[PDB]
Every structure is written in C-alpha cells, then in structure tokens.
C-alpha cells in the first residue's frame, strides 16, 4: 500500500511550498491541529510523543508558539534524526539536544510557529501542528 503513503507525502511537500511562496500567500493546505485541556493537554503531549518517538515535551511550557511537525517516511534511513528548517543543514541525532533547543525556544517565546522535520522508518509521514492547550 505503497501508493498510499506517497500521495500524502507529495501533498505535504506542497503544503510546505504554499506556506513558503510569499507574503500574500494567504492560501494553504490543511493539516491536523491538536487541542487538549490541562490533564487532557498533558495527555496530548504524551500522545504526540508516543505517536512516533520520544521527543522533548511538557515540563514547563509557555505553549505560546505552535509547532508545525512535518514527518517523512524514512525508508532507507536507519537513524532517527530530526532537523529544523530555519537552521538549515543541521541534523540532530539525540532528542535531548532537540529538547534543549526547542525548550530554549519555549523560554524565548511574533506568534510564529516553528517548523520541524523528523525522519524515522517507524513513523508514517504526517503533518500535525501542536498549539498550546487550554488551561
């Protein structure tokens, strides 16, 4: 069901390009938005981590900025690596460094949502965004 993942991946690449066309590129493709109450919010963060692999989450979070998670089918790659689009050409092996970096962005706090890209053979390519949960 190879034909199946692919359509989605091409579409996510397209979502990224509409996002990147310009200032007036109001236009875009949808994606999953995740919302959860505080007990529910904690559950949700745990769930997002559990869905693919463990990642820095929860603890003390301003939750001020959304996180656009874009996933890629990772056949032919044997190492769980996640990278940041803005800091291009930078790959992170251990998610502890991802924890320190993105939590430093959490303490920094525009309202712009950081984009993320993570490649793992276990993970099916997706396009979820996690905004702060209700308190």
């Amino acid at each position: 069901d190879d034909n199946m993942m692919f359509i989605t991946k091409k579409m996510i690449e397209i979502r990224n390009l509409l996002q990147k066309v310009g200032q007036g590129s109001t236009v875009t493709l949808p994606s999953i938005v995740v919302i959860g109450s505080q007990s529910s919010g904690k559950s949700s963060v745990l769930e997002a981590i559990v869905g693919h692999e463990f990642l820095p989450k929860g603890s003390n979070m301003i939750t001020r900025r959304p996180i656009e998670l874009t996933l890629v089918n990772d056949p032919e790659a044997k190492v769980d690596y996640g990278e940041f689009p803005d800091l291009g050409l930078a790959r992170v092996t251990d998610f502890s460094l991802i924890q320190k970096t993105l939590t430093e962005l959490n303490q920094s706090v525009t309202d712009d949502p950081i984009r993320l890209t993570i490649h793992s053979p276990n993970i099916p390519d997706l396009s979820l965004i996690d905004l702060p949960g209700y308190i």
């Binding site: 199946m4 993942m5 359509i7 007036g24 236009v27 559990v50």
Partner: protein, 96 residues
C-alpha cells in the same frame, strides 16, 4: 531507546486483560497503529478535497502576478545574464 516498540508491545498486550471489551472487530477502536492508519486516511481525504479549491486560488495569484508582468515591463523576459551581456556590449562600443 526503542521506546516505540515498547509502547507498541504494551498496547498489544494490555487489551488481553479485557480482550472482548475492546479488541478486534469490537465496535471501539484502539492502540496507536489503527489511529495512525485512520489519520492517514482522513488527511488524504480532506487534503484531496481542498486540492481543487487551493489549486484555483494558486492560479488566481499566478494570474495577478502575470498581469503585473504585462503592465510593468510589457512581459519581455529578462535574465541576469541577458542584462550583463547587453551592458557589456554597450560598454565595449563606448570604449572603442
């Protein structure tokens, strides 16, 4: 590491305590893999639905950019190499 597999082993194993209450073909659905499959399904369906309208919008923004290319510069194409070549030809004639 390999937390993924582990969270998968527990999900496989836990429903065993009460398999009939929530297990295959039971009305309810649970565990991470079926959820993921459904997420894939819905994402594909909804994205596919918005595809035509988003496509039309892209064509609209392309048309407006093109019209501005008509009003400004009369739609004559230009590359950096064309600009440099023309200016170099001018300078060589002037210098001679």
């Amino acid at each position: 590491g390999n937390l993924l597999a582990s969270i998968n082993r527990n999900e496989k194993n836990y429903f065993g305590s009460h398999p009939t209450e929530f297990g295959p073909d039971s009305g309810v659905s649970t565990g991470v893999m079926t959820l993921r499959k459904k997420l894939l399904q819905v994402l594909e369906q909804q994205m596919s639905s918005k595809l035509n309208e988003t496509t039309e919008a892209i064509q609209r923004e392309l048309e407006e950019t093109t019209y501005q290319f008509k009003v400004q510069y009369n739609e004559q194409p230009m590359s950096a190499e064309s600009y440099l070549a023309a200016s170099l030809d001018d300078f060589k004639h002037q210098f001679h």
